[PDB]
Write a protein that binds this ligand. Structure first.
Ligand SMILES: N[C@@H](Cc1ccccc1)C(=O)O
Ligand SMILES: N[C@@H](Cc1ccccc1)C(=O)O
Ligand SMILES: N[C@@H](Cc1ccccc1)C(=O)O
Ligand SMILES: N[C@@H](Cc1ccccc1)C(=O)O
Ligand SMILES: N[C@@H](Cc1ccccc1)C(=O)O
Ligand SMILES: [K+]
Ligand SMILES: [K+]
Ligand SMILES: [K+]
Ligand SMILES: [K+]
Ligand SMILES: [K+]
Ligand SMILES: [Zn+2]
Ligand SMILES: [Zn+2]
Ligand SMILES: [Zn+2]
Ligand SMILES: [Zn+2]
Ligand SMILES: [Zn+2]
Ligand SMILES: [Zn+2]
Ligand SMILES: [Zn+2]
Ligand SMILES: [Zn+2]
Lengths: 192, 84, 192, 192, 192, 84, 84, 192, 192, 84, 84, 192, 192
């Protein structure tokens, strides 16, 4: 069952409480004017970062999928994405690059963005995030192939020395996996 | 009220000429034909005139003022006058 | 009283507990293999980000302050800094630029770094961080003047749309405040 | 009276109708599969672009205005902004740069963003947008001064030859207007 | 039947009326000095953006097609193109890159430009625009092959968060489709 | 103590007006209603007033001072007064 | 007309020297051999002379004027003279 | 037997003595205020640079190795590394680029960093450093393949004329060695 | 008395011995084939880094000082310089920028280079290095003024986290000190 | 030696105050408690005092000097005094 | 020739000091020991002296001149003297 | 007397003979096929590099000097220039930047180029070259002022370690010398 | 027989004489203060540019060739190189890029540098220089293959119009010649 707006309202206080406790455990004064509203702002922020849990590919599926009877590679690159490291609960940020060989069905930018949004706004692991976006696109278009590349910087690693260091993950399905030429062209067209 | 401060900017042969602040003599300001205003963002009022500073200096002499000092600061030319 | 290593050990369990609670409140399963150790890793991470509370300028003061009888502007720019927004508990990252007109006393790079570390690793507000570093330097050198400039990106703002948007704050003391020429030169020598 | 959600619902059909009419007047077929939902998507889009009408600085005013007793220049630059040319109804895009000398009161990033959002999401003229933002900040902080710079590209001009051509406007209030040093420092700290 | 100059004159008032209606539906005053002429300017602007309807490849075909008995790849890259999203009626901008293996017949820059102009200045979908340009060139030269690549930014997407995010489409015909070496070389000579 | 130095910044029709240093006459400072303070980072105290320089000049005349010279330096407008 | 304002730029030992504005005394301007003009873009007329300021000051003394104050502002050196 | 903290304490005096001797042999006065503590600071610095001797891949091995059942290429690039030339005892600096085709097992960034740390903080030779990191990763993950690339600048060479000259080494194991396509993709995804 | 070639020959063995001792104290085997000649290569390298001790401005003074009766600012920028931190015996690298207002006498590039070489090739402190170069130029030309600016990265700081962090020092004598316009122009012409 | 030039920088309420050059009256310099020095790079000696300019002006009046003019130039505030 | 203009740059305690223009009194220039020259690029001659302005001011008093005003402009410190 | 075409023909043999001698003194064989024509090619090359002697500003003066009654700053920047170091007979290369405040008379680009050509194609010293160009322009236009800036790299210095090191000289006449504002504007408009 | 230090001393006067002759043949006055020492400085400079004749690969061969039993590609790129065109005796400058597949034996940076130095400091032709360096490396390592690329600008061409025009030469031996994959990788790792 996907998270609901009710769940958020019912859990906000629990989150707020936990954050207020954390403030004390760190040695801070939850009473400072600057910290008074922090437990709620922190809780709200954390709910926003994980709002992908309250959605599913279904809510996006049907909507915008026009048929321009297109059968050649379509690429959408430099899609900003922000996620949360599931091991330290610190965000890892970067870009997502997508490509697919349509089987008549094309995906609208709006839906594409939503798909990336759904899985990245969760406690994640870059490789999982990559595969989920790839599979989601595959199910939404039944394409001849799809490729997803993600490059990101992990704050949990950066704030311990790094800001320049980047992790690159990829998932290639269909012709993107079996045809080295398609894979190459895709990487050429995004690595600009 | 023996002291007066007037000024003009960028060029001296043309106005406007600042002739007073919020607490300036209303009669004198009126005699000079000055208008009052508060530029947006500023926390004070100012009296100005469209005449070139020379004209204002002559008019001020008639009312008994004399130039004691003149100085430049930034792009503003200032005159300090004294009456009695 | 500055935070101590004992405090951390005594509070780690409380922090861990709070994070485990947060995990549940978000809709996640604290039992997943990927989440099992998260409560501790998150707690430790949060203690690292706030380790500046367990220190004071004093611990740095005495140490390295050599007298090269120098009396001209010294600058240390592009100092990376990582802090935590005290309103959302999300990190804001950037660079710190420092300059000072010594009155014979010069500050070592090591100490300078430590000063930035002490105040940035806390729940902060960019303007406060800026002033604290400036004042710390002033008290450690009794200089003729000092200037501190910080430019940063707030993750709490970025992960809501921004990554390019930057906040610039500054604190100018002594000649850095009163002499426009010193201020200009400083800004020129850092804005490279 | 600011625009309301009711107004949008009551007017959507009117907008939709106008666009459908426009489609015909262009020589297109409002019946094509690709154009069927266009009248609504166009109407909704235009409502979004002008959602600034249904808000006022008041809704933002009170909220977040903490007092860190700060009294030195604070700058937020490279704030992306998207607006609509009131003469052609074609969007003009760019960045907004803000600076202010606080009189104890500081402005939160969230509120700042909202201010820029309120005025930019309207049929505008770059100079007006610049002044409104500056005045709004002045009223929300009663600062010693404020400056706003906007640089943008006008699609209505670009799609007639230009994409590189940019318009720069500014509004300087208080010390930002009267003190050339403050103005210079501001323009230095933003033009990076 | 292609749109004619008469159609424009006969429809300008309809367009102007629709826009005047839209202004009201948005909550604006069509009477403001700044909006008085807006209905006509907007209408005129929209006709310009869709002037591609009043033309055909035929009007270009015959004209400039010299025979330098050339039989090696010819490329024209970084061709600016401006179009309109048929779903939201918001423009999407970018560049077009063309390449072809002539079969004796070469195409003049002037004509090439016109071909891109004809299909881009219409309500479009990036993939269709790409194909149409490619097919147009194929019919105008009966070449051994042709390739067309388009990279664009969609304002309808940008003005909802993106300005860096780009969509890349391509159409490869003839040897550009069947010979991986030709395709690679083309992508190499344009991705500069 | 025959010499006096007062100043204002950026604009002349509004204060504050600097009226003294750490070694200024306490009575005179009091008569002017000046406050004392030391701006963070500065190694000296200063006496200031919220009145515009014009006002301070008039008050100073009553105590026997006369403006000898006025000059601009940076964004600071300065007055050098003399008593007896 | 007791007050007069003249000036020169960049260097003091060479002209031109601005000796009047649009409302200056035509006779005095003629006596000084001044030319009139309105620089493109400016909304005012100005009287100038090719003589160095020193020469103009001597000539002005003959007509009864005395230098009351001299000040620099920007790259402009200004003289404020008074007659009677 | 790996070096121990005891070893450092017992050898610090010997190191200090050697440096004090070197100071004299160079013509300097070990008594200058500026040189007084140098023998110890130098000794400590050199122990820091070689602290990788007091560790082994084992200390890292077990810890963080989660199974996301991932089987596609993972890359971590632009990893800053600092080492010492074993020939001149002058540091050579640069970046490390890692890639590997997991056989279900994935390596955490934290562990990866430590691996690079262990071998680079020793008296080294760039090619050995490169192989050691590659072999370490192979043993910790039993992957289908791994690739390591290091580019560095040698201070022992730069301070004799160079700062721009760079040495590039690589070690390709498994599919990274046998499959040119994997190798190419890796080099493509890192050379950005 | 400046260091002499004899001194180097007489001390090489002492240096070598010290380095061999250091190798053992670190836990290494001075016997490894890769370390055998290290004691001598290290010793030689260190003597090279400190060869500035065996010279004096006098050896450079007389030589090349032509009189082109020049009296306008002359600048030589982006002069590479490599030095050694006297606190850790770790190099700090950067660039030196020089400017001077000749009083008829001009300095040849060759001599200028030598002057920078003489003081940078010693155990140093950035500020001292800066003043010595400035004073040396002043003594060799009796100029109206001179300015020296040095920016550098400290390896002793970098290899502890930084590579981007830079220290900027300056020494302004004569008109470079007293005339703000000269100082500004100098900084303008070098900060390119 | 009827003329005197003194100055201060950046701020007027604090010293140092420059009170003389290489050819200044040794007695007067001594009476003021001035120190002599030549800043590295400069081709001239200077006499300075740590007192704020106000203090120096008062002391100078006792020795018979009067301020004739005060002006700003760069970040330097200068006073021209005359004795007899 | 009642008016005189002299100046110095950057620093006041050292020369050179500009004491005249092309049309200055040859005798006075000689009495001051001034040299004449025309800097390359400039369209005018100038008389200068290597003495600090203070020295020149004292010498000028002996010839009957008195300082009427002193001002700064750019990095140039100027004096306006009057004789009779 | 300027050098003449007769002089070259009468001296070419002399130059060639000298170079033939140089080839032998170096240890080379003036007989190698690759060296046979070197004596003349080198002689011809050296004459070309010094052809500036056979000309005078007069030959350029009269020609193109139109009167557009222009009285505002005119700038010509990034003028490539190649000269010869008179001390080593090795070339020093760079750019020339010119500016002038016309007194009704303007200078044609062709003539300007020729003036730079005349003085750079000689055995030179950067400061002289700078002054000669400035004076030449002054004499050709009787302007209110002129400025000349030259930045160069000296091969005689580069081929002894440097390629990045640059020498910057300037000559400011008239208002360019006396008005700091003019000088600043000029440096601003060229340092782009 | 390689040139010797004796040869230089014996020939310096001959060279000096030739240059003094050249000075006259050009129309100059060998007596000018600026030209007086030129004949010797020119002669010395020319001997430096040709000092590669007094050396052989042998003098470098034995020295530093450690065996790290490495068998994977090693690359050293962006090696500055200065040489002299044997046709005009004007220098041509650039960079050398080297790569080799070791057969157990590896080459030290010091030796590599010396090899490039030996051949470039002679009267050369870019292609020969390229081959000599490649062959030298081959003989010193008996590797599986080696590649050398040189890109340079010819002053003799530049100073006749060019500074941007570059010549690229290469020599591929062994696997670098026979295996297109190795060749591609090499070009990929250097063309960064
Ligand atoms: N704007 C003038 C100075 C000036 C300002 C104001 C009034 C008069 C003159 C300059 O730049 O020199
Ligand atoms: N702000 C004014 C200068 C000024 C400062 C103080 C008082 C009056 C005027 C300017 O720059 O023109
Ligand atoms: N520093 C002041 C000017 C000043 C200098 C010296 C003395 C007094 C005032 C300013 O910038 O406005
Ligand atoms: N140009 C002079 C100032 C000045 C202006 C006008 C007349 C005289 C002098 C300087 O910059 O120092
Ligand atoms: N050089 C002084 C200005 C000055 C010029 C001339 C004489 C005295 C002072 C400054 O920058 O503050
Ligand atoms: K004016
Ligand atoms: K004020
Ligand atoms: K003038
Ligand atoms: K002071
Ligand atoms: K001087
Ligand atoms: Zn993590
Ligand atoms: Zn926040
Ligand atoms: Zn428009
Ligand atoms: Zn759309
Ligand atoms: Zn080494
Ligand atoms: Zn150190
Ligand atoms: Zn040379
Ligand atoms: Zn050649």
């Amino acid at each position: 069952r996907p998270r609901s707006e009710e769940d958020n309202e019912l859990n906000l206080p629990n989150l707020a409480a936990a954050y207020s406790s954390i403030l004390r455990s760190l040695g801070e004064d939850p009473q400072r004017q600057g910290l008074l509203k922090t437990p709620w702002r922190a809780a709200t922020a954390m709910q926003f970062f994980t709002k992908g849990y309250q959605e599913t590919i279904s809510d996006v599926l049907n909507d915008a999928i026009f048929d321009e009877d297109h059968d050649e590679m379509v690429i959408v690159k430099d899609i900003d994405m922000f996620s949360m490291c599931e091991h330290h609960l610190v965000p890892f940020v970067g870009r997502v690059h997508i490509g697919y060989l349509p089987n008549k069905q094309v995906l609208g930018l709006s839906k594409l963005a939503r798909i990336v949004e759904i899985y990245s706004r969760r406690l994640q692991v870059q490789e999982r995030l990559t595969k989920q976006i790839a599979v989601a696109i595959t199910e939404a278009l039944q394409p001849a192939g799809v490729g997803v590349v993600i490059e990101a910087t992990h704050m949990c690693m950066v704030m311990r020395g790094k800001m320049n260091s980047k992790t690159v993950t990829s998932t290639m399905l269909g012709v993107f996996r079996e045809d080295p030429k398609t894979r190459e062209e895709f990487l050429t067209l995004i690595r600009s | 009220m023996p002291y007066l401060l007037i000024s003009t900017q960028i060029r001296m042969e043309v106005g406007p000429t600042m002739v007073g602040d919020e607490h300036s003599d209303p009669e004198l300001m009126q005699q000079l034909g000055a208008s009052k205003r508060r530029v947006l963002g500023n926390n004070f009022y100012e009296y100005y005139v469209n005449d070139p500073p020379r004209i204002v200096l002559d008019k001020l002499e008639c009312r008994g003022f004399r130039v004691l000092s003149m100085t430049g600061v930034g792009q503003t030319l200032v005159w300090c006058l004294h009456k009695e």
